[PDB]
Design a protein around this motif. Structure first.
Motif, short mmCIF file in Angstrom:
data_model
loop_
_atom_site.label_atom_id
_atom_site.label_comp_id
_atom_site.label_asym_id
_atom_site.label_seq_id
_atom_site.Cartn_x
_atom_site.Cartn_y
_atom_site.Cartn_z
N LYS B 352 -8.23 -5.73 -18.47
CA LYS B 352 -7.23 -6.75 -18.74
C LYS B 352 -5.93 -5.73 -19.14
N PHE B 353 -5.88 -4.81 -19.35
CA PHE B 353 -4.77 -3.80 -20.05
C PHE B 353 -3.72 -3.80 -18.84
N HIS B 354 -2.35 -3.64 -19.21
CA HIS B 354 -1.18 -3.86 -18.39
C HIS B 354 -0.85 -2.14 -18.30
N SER B 355 -0.34 -2.07 -16.95
CA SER B 355 0.25 -0.63 -16.56
C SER B 355 1.14 -0.22 -17.41
N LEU B 356 1.90 0.88 -17.25
CA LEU B 356 3.08 1.23 -17.88
C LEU B 356 4.23 0.59 -17.18
N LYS B 357 5.25 0.02 -18.13
CA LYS B 357 6.53 -0.43 -17.51
C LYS B 357 7.61 0.30 -18.09
N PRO B 358 8.20 1.07 -17.46
CA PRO B 358 9.28 2.22 -17.80
C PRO B 358 10.39 1.19 -18.57
N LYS B 359 10.78 0.04 -18.08
CA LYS B 359 11.84 -0.56 -18.34
C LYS B 359 11.94 -0.84 -19.99
N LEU B 360 10.69 -1.47 -20.48
CA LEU B 360 10.39 -1.57 -21.96
C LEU B 360 10.86 -0.38 -22.70
N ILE B 361 10.27 0.73 -22.34
CA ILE B 361 10.39 1.99 -23.15
C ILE B 361 11.74 2.39 -23.09
N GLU B 362 12.37 2.47 -21.74
CA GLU B 362 13.65 2.98 -21.73
C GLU B 362 14.69 2.12 -22.64
N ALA B 363 14.28 0.67 -22.70
CA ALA B 363 15.49 -0.19 -23.58
C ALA B 363 15.30 -0.07 -24.83
N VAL B 364 13.96 0.42 -25.22
CA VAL B 364 13.80 0.48 -26.88
C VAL B 364 14.31 1.85 -27.18
N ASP B 365 14.27 2.71 -26.37
CA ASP B 365 14.98 4.01 -26.68
C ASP B 365 16.55 3.75 -26.44
N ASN B 366 16.91 3.02 -25.69
CA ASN B 366 18.62 2.72 -25.71
C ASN B 366 18.84 1.88 -27.06
N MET B 367 17.82 1.07 -27.43
CA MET B 367 18.22 0.48 -28.71
C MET B 367 18.47 1.36 -29.81
N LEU B 368 17.43 2.16 -29.77
CA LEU B 368 17.36 3.23 -31.25
C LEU B 368 18.66 4.13 -30.88
N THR B 369 19.26 4.55 -29.94
CA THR B 369 20.16 5.18 -29.58
C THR B 369 21.54 4.38 -29.90
N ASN B 370 21.74 3.16 -29.51
CA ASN B 370 23.13 2.74 -29.07
C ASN B 370 23.21 1.30 -30.00
N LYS B 371 22.14 0.43 -30.02
CA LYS B 371 22.39 -0.87 -30.59
C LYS B 371 22.56 -0.76 -32.25
N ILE B 372 21.63 0.20 -32.70
CA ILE B 372 21.73 0.31 -34.40
C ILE B 372 23.13 1.18 -34.53
N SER B 373 23.64 1.94 -33.50
CA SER B 373 24.74 2.51 -33.73
C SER B 373 26.00 1.53 -33.57
N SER B 374 25.87 0.45 -32.74
CA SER B 374 26.75 -0.36 -33.03
C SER B 374 26.81 -1.42 -34.39
N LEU B 375 25.57 -1.57 -34.79
CA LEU B 375 25.60 -2.38 -35.89
C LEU B 375 25.88 -1.70 -37.28
N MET B 376 26.22 -0.37 -37.09
CA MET B 376 26.59 0.48 -38.04
C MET B 376 27.73 -0.18 -38.96
N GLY B 377 28.70 -0.22 -38.10
CA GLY B 377 30.09 -0.90 -38.49
C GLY B 377 30.04 -2.07 -39.30
N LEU B 378 29.27 -2.71 -38.48
CA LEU B 378 29.10 -4.34 -39.14
C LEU B 378 28.33 -4.10 -40.45
N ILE B 379 27.44 -3.28 -40.60
CA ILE B 379 26.72 -2.84 -41.87
C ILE B 379 27.91 -2.63 -42.72
#
Lengths: 514, 514, 514
Positions: B352-379
């Motif tokens: 039943k397990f799901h195969s690797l989906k690079p979209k999710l991993i890439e976009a989570v890495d993109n989160m940790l690189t850039n969206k927290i970066s954008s939110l820093m000024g708001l903080i």
């Protein structure tokens, strides 16, 4: 366009490419950051628990910290990056390891526990527009394994030591210890022995023989621990804002303190230059790794015999280094350690390696020949951007005097004791005369205090000593408690007694104490 | 668009997808809620029965609660989520675990008995616009099995500890106990050792050696129970609105109380940041679980040999983790515990397990690189939205003085005892003069009280002490009983006696007592 | 025929046979000696470097040592067996480990470096006719491997702990350390947790919070190190012949010191009994080992299948122990540790083992039933052979007074200050009156001093205090310097000042100082 901007630009443009191509980030050190360039000169302060590193930094500052508190107990449970903030406060570690204008984006590798046990303390201070100081957690003396920590302290300390301006190693005579944790830490400090300054604190509270042979025991242990026969300069003294306990070696303590202080004062004109120093260091190491990888790749066969060829090559690696040195005219000190290269090499598949690309090597040589050459004039023009770190005095030093001269014998200077209120050496009647002097906002101005306490007919040198002792907040103007303390000293001199060089917390006003 | 809104939005948009795809909700922690973002900074208070947690929270509040009552007896039969309500009152647990603006929709999993033994206390308070406090039921000392409870207390406490701002662990010297229930509770608290503050209450009612070695016995037991050799900071004192019993260690008690108070005062500018902290924590754990599941799925064969392949893979799991770390450059501290992953893995069907989906991993890495970066000024822009939790004083503290100064020696300050009604130190004749003073609505105004009791010709410092002691309701204006108490203190000073720092309930007016 | 003679005789006659037959000497402990019986009650004193163990023992003695010197520096480079010698002197370790009347012939196993770093100090002292004291070398805090020493310190310390009357573990607040060497040492002390007394010295020179949390840090570490949750009794104080530094906890220090002192005073009537205690202990362990070996031998087959049978038996060993307990009615606490028996068993060839010999087991049971029974009356008759170890006072204690009473209010007692030579508080004019008093051999006799200093018309209690303070050599008679010190105290009391409880080395005469 600053010289720091030029350094970071040249790095990101044409040192990073070969780094990523030949995975220098997977062997020696990962790709750098804009932080290592944009950061200010930095002093990292290490030592075991209860050594007093917080006391050291506050003594340098003449100011308390937003986050960290002094304690003879182990209170430093986290790294403290104390730096210049526009407003008093603190900011945590996962937000410090990302901040654009802080040296620590490359600490994100370790993550989790390190970043939770990693703090930042922002405050405005004249020391802090110059430097940032990293108070490390007290190095544990409980004989602990590396796995027990949530982070690799040896690796983090090596990462710092690759970038620190000055690393100070603080050891106290009272609780003299040399731990295995510190031992493996100094093996992490291997490669940057220039930046370590060993400091023996709390040398005044012990006897002469006790201090002598605690220094002894410590440095017999140190001689074996460091394993380098080169002598490391020691600084024996009490970096301590309170009067000396035993005055047998006060001269030695003050001499070592002054020498260390001046060595720290030399860093401002040292700040951009050692950025260039580390730039050259990593450039030479990177190109050496590049030739190593290129030679291995060209020795790699097409498809068959790969296992046997790799097994031969890993053992043949040393003479490969010899051939690389001979045919590239590169110093033997630029190579990494042969055995470490060994265990790092078996983990890699030799087919994936990249072939030699002369463009990168040629342009790095062009860097070392011409772009640092162009940046030299910029360095010389920017040599005075920030020359003023210094190790400042304190609330009780011969600059707090302000409008007073230090020591001299004028006739405009006066006799030892002629005038001061006698029974008014108690707080309420201090305040009576304090307000008959007509202070402003509960504060007697500097000129008003001058004219009042020059009528004491005491020598101007001792009057300045009274002022420097009393004026705790160092604003050049006396409050109620500082005035009371000053006139207390004046009355004590009337009775006949020598003014202490630095006042004890006992004579420090209770509200002005930490 | 607040920073909290951005955090919850980024979560619900692109962290939940991989969570649901790879059943992170079935392994470590279920899908989050809007509550963990919209909630205010929160202090969860645990401890065994009769410890006095209700007394702690009311002492912090200077106010009673709608629902919960103080008792030396075990009265906390339910969790109490005391929070800011527009009107005084309470609301039950099944309606608390659903409320849009409360942190507790994810408590619906446990259900039934937990939600019936789960309560909410809504009141308007200046502390409560800042924080919410979770008074836990007294941890049972009756050596009880987990099955006997109607809910899994270890799991609920772990769920809190994943989200609490500060977890306080309260232990009393009189009834010093270390139970197995609390032991398994602290193993539930494993993973968040930062948030625990251990507090030793009722340290003043016992002798010096008694307090010394009850602290001892408690923390010998604690050293083994926690199993982590890292020292946990203790706070020894009496958080207690009544005068001290034994004054031998009053300095230590007040120092520890002040340190804990300031540590609590530091949370407001800590409130959104630790939301981001937990966001990073769960992001890294989620992606590590994602790589684990992806590797297992790709190792899963098509249809045949599935049983043998799964039996091999479950034992091969550790080196799978090693390979994942090597090929994804992810810290070893981000992985879950290998054995726990073991027993959780045999329960699942590997097909039943799901195969690797690079979209999710890439976009989570993109989160940790850039969206927290954008939110820093708001903080940084929102750093001052709510800075004012504080641990406030009480009915008897040096702020209740109001228009009075605290301690000083003016000549506008006066002599120890000059004027007060002598035999009128009884209630009716207090009231006679209280109404000859012409009060308003049975209350003497602040200025009228000032002008009357300045004619007492007492020092202004002691007059302010009288005011802070008398003014129980802390409205800055004196009622009949508060006036009687104040003039009682004035008469006692006429007779000659030192003013207590904090008044006992005995001297507290009977109607003003709890 | 003493009870000690009976114990050693019964041992050598019928405990040694089974020991040698079943190689108990090769598994748990080698064959005993006449020394363990003939020796006096003994206190072994361990602690790290610079703890002050020499200071402890000299404070107990009120006398210096032939061999060992006090030093805050590590001077104890060898074990010091200080014992009663007819003449002042010392004797080395290879001659100590052989001496017929010394407890140490069984130390010859370790040999070489231990015996060279093993010393004996013979002196006549009233403490030493009672006890012998083993000052251990300061336990190293340099994180050292066991192989680096020339001897196995863990094994030697276990050998002592099997035989010591009292093991004292000394830890100092100034240089508070918990080393891995001490950790493995206390695991060597495992099995005899009764004999350990933990003592925190130098508790007076530090502040109240400093002492509090150094005790803390030490005993958090101790809780994990010992691994036994049972509380170990601590003794916090300053066993120190000089006046207190900080008097905040003087009551606690003196209470702990008195409690430890009395616990040490209880050993004389404890001396032969714990010989019998260890005799029973080793008898039960020896017979348990005997049944284990007998069962293994009877399970051993004749010649074939020996390897497989041994491989099965080593794993079957636990249920063998269960069967032995069931069929011999022997307590589970008498068995050795199963895993240790494991690794010790594979090293042995199972064919060589001896079969069960009921004679030895029956006669050992007969011992435990009847020969200790016969020796009980001898023990009761010999209960008073030597009851007087004690922890004696010093040169400055309320027994040195001699013919003076301690504290009281007679009219035969006199006024605070009536008579003493005024300017004669200097040494030469002290001596003038010292010799106008007509002393004998430069010494004023006790009665002459009594009659002279009773004319001072001071209260007899304070006069006795003067005598106890002055009389350093405690011979009950005053020399020139002791007389000068006494009359110095008398003059100070004339001027008006309280007599110190114990005199500092400063006021101790220079020749009488150590």
């Amino acid at each position: 366009q600053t010289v720091t901007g030029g350094l970071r630009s040249l790095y990101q443009r044409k040192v990073l490419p070969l780094e990523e191509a030949y995975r220098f980030h997977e062997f020696h050190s990962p790709a750098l950051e804009d932080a290592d360039f944009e950061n200010k000169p930095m002093i990292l302060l290490v030592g075991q628990y209860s050594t007093g590193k917080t006391t050291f930094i506050r003594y340098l500052l003449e100011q308390d910290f937003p986050g960290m508190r002094i304690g003879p107990e182990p209170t430093t449970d986290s790294f403290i990056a104390v730096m210049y903030g526009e407003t008093e406060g603190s900011t945590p570690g996962n937000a410090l390891v990302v901040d654009p204008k802080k040296p620590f984006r490359k600490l994100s590798r370790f993550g989790n526990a390190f970043l939770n046990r990693f703090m930042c303390s922002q405050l405005p201070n004249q020391v802090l527009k110059s430097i940032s100081i990293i108070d490390s957690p007290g190095i544990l003396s409980g004989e602990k394994q590396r796995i027990s920590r949530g982070y690799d302290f040896c690796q983090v300390l090596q990462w710092f030591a690759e970038r620190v301006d000055r690393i100070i190693l603080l050891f106290d005579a009272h609780k003299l210890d040399i731990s295995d944790e510190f031992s493996e830490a100094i093996k992490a400090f291997r490669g940057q022995d220039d930046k370590i300054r060993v400091v023996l604190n709390k040398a005044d509270q012990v006897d002469t023989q006790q201090l002598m042979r605690v220094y002894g025991a410590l440095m017999w242990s140190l001689g074996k621990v460091i394993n380098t026969p080169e002598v490391l300069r020691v600084y024996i003294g009490s970096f301590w804002a309170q009067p000396l306990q035993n005055t047998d070696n006060r001269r030695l303590f003050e001499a070592e303190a002054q020498d260390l202080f001046r060595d720290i004062q030399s860093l401002p004109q040292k700040a951009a230059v050692r950025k260039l120093n580390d730039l050259i260091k990593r450039a030479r190491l990177a190109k050496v790794h590049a030739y190593i990888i290129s030679y291995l790749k060209k020795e790699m066969p097409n498809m068959f015999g790969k296992e046997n060829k790799k097994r031969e090559l890993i053992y043949r690696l040393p003479e490969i280094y010899v051939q690389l040195q001979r045919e590239y005219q590169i110093s033997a000190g630029d190579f990494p350690e042969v055995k470490a290269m060994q265990e790092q090499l078996e983990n890699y598949d030799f087919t994936k390696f990249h072939s030699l690309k002369p463009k990168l090597i040629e342009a790095v040589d062009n860097m070392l020949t011409n772009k640092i050459s162009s940046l030299m004039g910029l360095i010389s023009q920017e040599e005075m951007n920030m020359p003023t770190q210094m190790v400042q005095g304190g609330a009780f030093d011969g600059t707090t005097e302000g409008p007073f001269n230090q020591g001299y014998g004028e006739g405009a200077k006066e006799g030892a004791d002629e005038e001061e209120w006698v029974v008014a050496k108690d707080k309420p009647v201090y305040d009576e005369l304090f307000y008959t002097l007509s202070p402003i906002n509960g504060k007697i101005s500097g000129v008003n205090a001058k004219k009042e306490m020059v009528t004491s007919k005491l020598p101007n040198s001792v009057l300045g000593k009274i002022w420097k002792l009393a004026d705790c907040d160092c604003d050049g103007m006396l409050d109620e408690e500082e005035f009371a303390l000053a006139k207390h000293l004046i009355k004590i001199k009337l009775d006949g007694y020598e003014l202490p060089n630095s006042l004890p917390p006992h004579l420090v006003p209770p509200s002005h104490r930490k």
